[PDB]
Design a protein around this nucleic acid. Sequence first.
DNA 1: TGGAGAATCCCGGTGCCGAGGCCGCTCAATTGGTCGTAGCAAGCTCTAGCACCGCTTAAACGCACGTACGCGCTGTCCCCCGCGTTTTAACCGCCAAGGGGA
DNA 2: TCCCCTTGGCGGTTAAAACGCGGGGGACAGCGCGTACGTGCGTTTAAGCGGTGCTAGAGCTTGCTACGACCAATTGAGCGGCCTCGGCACCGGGATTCTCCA
Lengths: 109, 93, 98, 74, 80, 75
Amino acid sequence: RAKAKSRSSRAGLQFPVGRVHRLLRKGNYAERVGAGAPVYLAAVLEYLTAEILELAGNAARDNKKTRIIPRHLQLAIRNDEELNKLLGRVTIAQGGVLPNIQAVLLPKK
Amino acid sequence: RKESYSVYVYKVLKQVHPDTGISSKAMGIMNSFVNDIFERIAGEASRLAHYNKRSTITSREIQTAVRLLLPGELAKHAVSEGTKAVTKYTSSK
Amino acid sequence: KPHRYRPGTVALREIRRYQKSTELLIRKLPFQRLVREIAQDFKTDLRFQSSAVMALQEACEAYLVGLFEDTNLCAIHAKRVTIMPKDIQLARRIRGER
Amino acid sequence: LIRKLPFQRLVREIAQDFKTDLRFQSSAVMALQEACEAYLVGLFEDTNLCAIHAKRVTIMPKDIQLARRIRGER
Amino acid sequence: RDNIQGITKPAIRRLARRGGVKRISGLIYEETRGVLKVFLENVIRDAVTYTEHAKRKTVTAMDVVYALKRQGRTLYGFGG
Amino acid sequence: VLRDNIQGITKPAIRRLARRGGVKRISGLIYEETRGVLKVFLENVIRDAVTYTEHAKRKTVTAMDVVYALKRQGR
DNA sequence: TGGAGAATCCCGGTGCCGAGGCCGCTCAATTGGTCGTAGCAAGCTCTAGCACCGCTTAAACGCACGTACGCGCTGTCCCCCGCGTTTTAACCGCCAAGGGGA
DNA sequence: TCCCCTTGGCGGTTAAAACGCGGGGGACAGCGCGTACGTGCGTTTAAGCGGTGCTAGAGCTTGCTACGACCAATTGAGCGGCCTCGGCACCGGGATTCTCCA
C-alpha cells in the first residue's frame, strides 16, 4: 500500500479537495459528484480567498496595521469594482462604510 | 467537532502577504465568505445538472456556474486556475 | 465671548467621524429590550443568545445606515440639504419596500 | 410596444459578442422582449416617482439615475 | 413597554451621520422608528420559525443569519 | 453582421413605454439614456442565456434558457 | 489677510489579550477492490429556424409652432443647529434562580 | 440528582440623552421668461403578414465501458485545548490644522 497523497497536494491547492468532495455529497446537490468537480471548485475558492486577502492586506498596510481587521475587508471589497459586484448585497460585521460625503454638502467657497 | 476553513484561509494569506495577519473576527468573515461562495456555486452547479437532466456534478458544471456567478475578470481568472488545478490533478495521479 | 461654529460645520465633523468608525451606534440594552419586546408576540419564553441579538443589531443598523444614504440622495434630488419623511417613503418605494 | 423585427435584430446583434452563429427560437426572442418591456415600463414608473418628487412633471435622465441607483442597479 | 422609544434621537442621528446626512427634519425620528420596527419584526419572525422547526427554545445567531439570507440581506461574520 | 440596431427602439416606442409607466412629459435626454439602460439590461440576460446554451452543447438558445437567465437576474 | 481658539494629528508610553503556534487524538480522508450504470458516442428523423420575395399599411419622422413647464432670482421666516445645563438610565459587576437536559 | 446558562435584580456612577434658547440659513412660496416639448400634418420607410424552399440541428434510440458509489482497512490531517508575547489601543500632552469673525 502506497503512502497517501492528499488530493489537494496532487492538485497543488491549499484548499481541501477531500472536504469539498464530502460537502458536495452531504449537501445533496446531485445524485453523483465527479472526481474533478471538488478540484475545480476548491481552486476557485482558493482564488477568491487570495484576491480578497491581497486587497485587504493592502488596506491594512495603508492604515499601518499588520492584521486584517473586518474594516480592511470591507474597504477592500467596496473599493473593488468586481468584489463589490460579487458582494453588493452582503453585509459585513464591523465593516462600516466607505468615507463618502456628497459634494453638494461640503462647505461652499 | 465544528469545521472551519480558517486553517486554509491562513495558508492562502501567507501566499499573498507573508508578513500580514488576521483577526479571528475577520477570519469569521472569511469563513462566512468561503461558505457563501461554495453554497452559491454548488447550488448553481446543482441547478445546471438538473436543467440538463444529469445525475453528476461535473467540472463542466462548476465551470459554467463560475461563469454564471462571478463577474468579469474574476470569472476568467477563476476559470483559468480551476482548469489548471484539474489538469494538474489528472496529470499527477 | 466663546466661539461658535456655523450651522453645518459640526454636522460635517460628525459625518467624517461616523463614516470612519465601525462600532455600533444604537445602545446595547435598549436594543435587547426591543428584540425581546418584539419576540413576545411570536412565542413566550423564547431566549436569544447574546450573539443572536448582536447579529441582529448589525443587520438592522446596516439596514438603517443603508437607507439613510438612499434618502439623502432623495433629499439632494429635491435640492434639499434636509432629509424629510417623504424621502424615506420615496427611497423605500423605489426599493419595492413601501 | 416595441416592434418585433427591430428588437430581434437588436438581440442577434448583442449575441454576436457572446457566440457567433447562435440560433434563437421564436419563443426565446419573445420571452426576451416581454421581459424588456416589463423592465422598462416598471423602471419609468420609478423615474416618475423621482420626477413627481422634486415637484417636476418632466422626467430627466437624473431621475433614471436616481431610480437605478436606489433599485440597486448602480 | 414601547421600547421602540428607546431608539433615541441621538442614535438615529448618528446612523444618519454614517449615512452622510447633513440636515435632519425632526419628523424623521418617528419615521425611522417605524421603519426599524417593521424591519426587525420580519427578521425575528422568520428566525423563530427556524428555532422552533429545529425544536429549540433558544433562538441562535444562525437562525438570524438564515432569516437574513432568506430575506436577501446576507450577513457575514456570525457564521457560514 | 449587425450594427446600429439600438436605434431600432424608436423614440415613440420609448414614449409608449414611458406613458405605460405613467410618465406625462419626457425630456429628449431620456431617449438616449433609456437606450443605454435597455442595452445594459439586455446584454446581461443574453450573456447568461448563451452560457446556458453552451452548457447544453446546443447551437440554439431556447425559451427555457431565457427563463433561467431571467430567473438569475431576478436574484 | 489675520488671528485666536477650538479641533485634530502625531508621537511616545503602557497594558493586556488575543493571535499565532504547539501537542494530543481522532475520525475522516485516502487506498485498494468490486459492481452497476450512466452518459458518451453513433446514427436516424424531421423540425423548426433561417433566408428570401412581395405587398400593405400603419408606424416613424421631419418640421412648424405655440404654450406650458423648468429654472433662476427674491423674500421670509421658521425651525433645526449648536452649544451650555440638567437628568436619567446605560453599562458593568456581581449574585440568583431555576430550568432544562442528561 | 446535578451541571450548565440564560434571565432577572442591585447598585453606582457616569456618560449620554433630554431640555432650552438664540439665530441663521435653508426651506419654501411667489414671480418672470424663454425655451423646450407636446400636438398636428404631410411624407416615407420599413415592419408585419402570407408564401416558398432548404438544411441544420434538436431530440430520441441504442450500446457499452468508464467511472463513481460503496465499503472495509489504514493513517495522518485537522480540530479542541493550552500558552505566551507582541500588536494595538488607549492615554497625555505638545504641534499643526482649520475654521470664522474681523
